[PDB]
Amino acid sequence: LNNYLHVFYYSWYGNPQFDGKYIHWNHPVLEHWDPRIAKNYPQGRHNPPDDIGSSFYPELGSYSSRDPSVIETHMRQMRSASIGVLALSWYPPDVNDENGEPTDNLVPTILDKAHKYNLKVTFHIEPYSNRDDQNMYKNVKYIIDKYGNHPAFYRYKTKTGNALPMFYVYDSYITKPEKWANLLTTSGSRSIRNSPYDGLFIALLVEEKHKYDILQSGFDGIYTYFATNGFTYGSSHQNWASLKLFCDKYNLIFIPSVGPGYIDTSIRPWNTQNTRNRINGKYYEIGLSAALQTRPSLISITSFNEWHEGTQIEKAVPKRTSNTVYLDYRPHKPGLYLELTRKWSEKYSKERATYALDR
Numbered sequence: 001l002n003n004y005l006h007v008f009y010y011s012w013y014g015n016p017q018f019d020g021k022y023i024h025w026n027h028p029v030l031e032h033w034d035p036r037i038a039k040n041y042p043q044g045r046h047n048p049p050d051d052i053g054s055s056f057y058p059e060l061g062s063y064s065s066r067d068p069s070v071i072e073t074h075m076r077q078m079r080s081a082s083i084g085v086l087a088l089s090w091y092p093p094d095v096n097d098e099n100g101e102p103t104d105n106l107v108p109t110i111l112d113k114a115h116k117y118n119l120k121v122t123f124h125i126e127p128y129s130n131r132d133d134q135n136m137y138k139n140v141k142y143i144i145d146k147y148g149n150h151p152a153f154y155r156y157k158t159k160t161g162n163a164l165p166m167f168y169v170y171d172s173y174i175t176k177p178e179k180w181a182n183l184l185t186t187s188g189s190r191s192i193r194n195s196p197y198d199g200l201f202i203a204l205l206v207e208e209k210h211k212y213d214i215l216q217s218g219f220d221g222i223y224t225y226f227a228t229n230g231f232t233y234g235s236s237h238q239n240w241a242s243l244k245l246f247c248d249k250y251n252l253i254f255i256p257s258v259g260p261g262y263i264d265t266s267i268r269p270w271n272t273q274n275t276r277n278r279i280n281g282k283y284y285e286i287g288l289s290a291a292l293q294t295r296p297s298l299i300s301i302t303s304f305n306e307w308h309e310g311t312q313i314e315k316a317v318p319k320r321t322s323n324t325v326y327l328d329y330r331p332h333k334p335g336l337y338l339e340l341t342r343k344w345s346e347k348y349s350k351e352r353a354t355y356a357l358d359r
């Protein structure tokens with residue numbers, strides 16, 4: 001199991017039988033800012049199980065994230081990909097993404113099932129409304145108190161024998177560096193540094209200039225998230241050498257995010273510019289190759305199951321309806337991306353075993 005390979009995991013899917021209603025599979029078509037443009041594209045909620053908010057179709061169907069057999073299947077697939085860690089998309093209790101329901105209540109179950117398969121769970125902190133240094137303090141404290149003692153709780157284990165929680169902070173750049181500094185510099189007014197609630201906070205870098213904001217904020221690392229090559233400075237693998245150099249100079253953990261492709265036009269039908277064909281696995285292999293070449297401390301995978309954005313490595317199957325041919329992994333198997341991940345994970349694990357100064 002590669003504990004240096006993390007995958008972004010989503011637990012926001014629901015269906016009538018486990019949740020009382022569809023959740024996320026019935027995603028609305030997101031309106032283009034200009035309504036003159038939006039009126040020429042599809043509108044309304046998708047109607048599962050045959051019409052879902054994805055360009056692909058899952059082997060598990062329009063599944064529920066709180067179905068314990070669904071959680072087991074996922075853990076199996078990640079383990080067989082030899083991914084050691086899932087970075088769980090997280091909103092505070094009673095809070096949710098704008099298209100979903102609360103998910104914190106499911107964390108205990110996900111941890112238990114992760115333990116069953118010797119996987120670890122870290123936290124991908126989403127941009128909840130009014131998120132700032134003060135409530136981040138409370139949420140970090142909450143996460144660590146509530147889940148820190150579970151044996152599947154992820155800690156980056158340094159060779160010195162210390163073990164640090166990790167937090168990926170999505171759209172971290174929305175909050176000012178001076179506000180982050182309160183929480184993440186040693187002498188910040190509400191510093192968690194050197195406290196029992198200390199950890200490794202990874203910031204999202206979009207634009208090159210965010211490098212400098214990230215330093216000022218006191219983050220421990222950077223990740224790039226987006227699966228589309230060319231969409232941002234960070235998501236363009238041609239810039240990963242430079243980010244790596246920068247991170248080395250400033251003692252930051254560089255965590256490139258690699259995806260198998262991208263397509264979100266079932267919910268953002270205006271966003272065809274960012275669509276990337278999977279090329280039967282070659283897009284993913286180029287991404288993985290590009291990441292390995294930088295010799296990174298960790299690699300993140302976008303994503304296990306972000307089905308809306310077509311970045312999932314979860315098993316997908318052919319499906320055709322009266323008006324739709326879903327994308328799929330033909331001519332390969334539903335497990336193609338799991339198998340390609342296992343291949344490159346083993347490469348990474350071997351090569352990473354020769355990075356160390358002590359050899």
Ligand SMILES: OC[C@H]1CNC[C@@H](O[C@H]2O[C@H](CO)[C@@H](O)[C@H](O)[C@H]2O)[C@@H]1O
Binds near residue numbers: 089126306308
């Ligand atoms: O986890 C970080 C990031 C990944 N991309 C999707 C982001 O959520 C947003 O978009 C999805 C659809 O792709 C919506 O369902 C969510 O409501 C929205 O917040 C997510 O934050």
Ligand SMILES: [Mg+2]
């Ligand atoms: Mg060091």
